[PDB]
Amino acid sequence: PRKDPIILIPSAASSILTVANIKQFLLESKYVNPRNLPSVPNGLVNIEKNFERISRPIRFIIVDNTRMFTKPEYWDRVVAIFTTGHTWQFNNYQWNSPQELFQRCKGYYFHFAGDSVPQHVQQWNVEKVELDKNKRFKDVEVVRYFWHSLEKELISRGYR
């Protein structure tokens, strides 16, 4: 696949990662409360990543909505989905049940250490990732691990 891959990150009130704070997190390994940053009017951010195990840099389109999906083939480009924990998140997705969706797209569920994971989310085939509420010294490693996790997924989906 050669078009830019897509990461879906819609948000709910409880979301700890949204399009508003995802760049700071993934590029600077700096976690910031998303309500304390400028909103992103179009719900779209771009991030370029140079992976160790992929030759060319990869440019991600990271969106909080599915308005860009004007042809079904856009859905084939979705390589990761951040989940809010609401099952209604997927209602308008090409694959709208979590079982099918997370069999073919990598899912993540981020939450604060100490906060319980909803039972239905625990059952989903998504990777649960914890962040400290009040310490930030682990963030560098969490982000390194996230990128490694995503790199592995890209290689498996044929990105070279």
From Swiss-Prot:
Cellular component terms per the entry's GO annotation: Cdc73/Paf1 complex; euchromatin; nucleus
Keyword match Nucleus: yes
GO molecular function annotation: chromatin binding; RNA polymerase II C-terminal domain phosphoserine binding; RNA polymerase II complex binding
Source organism of this protein record: Saccharomyces cerevisiae (strain ATCC 204508 / S288c) (Baker's yeast)
Record-given protein name: Cell division control protein 73
UniProt record, GO biological process: mRNA 3'-end processing; negative regulation of DNA recombination; positive regulation of transcription elongation by RNA polymerase I; positive regulation of transcription elongation by RNA polymerase II; regulation of transcription-coupled nucleotide-excision repair; transcription elongation by RNA polymerase I; transcription elongation by RNA polymerase II
Protein origin, superkingdom: Eukaryota
Transcription regulation recorded as keyword: yes
Quaternary structure and partners: Component of the PAF1 complex which consists of at least CDC73, CTR9, LEO1, PAF1 and RTF1. Interacts with FACT subunits POB3 and SPT16.
Main location, first listed in the record: nucleus
Part of the intact protein present: 234 to 393 of 393
Family, per entry: Belongs to the CDC73 family.
Keywords (A to Z) from UniProt: Activator, Nucleus, Phosphoprotein, Transcription, Transcription regulation
Disulfide bond residue pairs: none
Function: The PAF1 complex is a multifunctional complex. Involved in transcription initiation via genetic interactions with TATA-binding proteins. Involved in elongation. It regulates 3'-end formation of snR47 by modulating the recruitment or stable association of NRD1 and NAB3 with RNA polymerase II. Also has a role in transcription-coupled histone modification. Required for activation of RAD6 ubiquitin conjugate and the BRE1 ubiquitin ligase which ubiquitinate 'Lys-126' histone H2B.
Cell location: Nucleus, Nucleoplasm
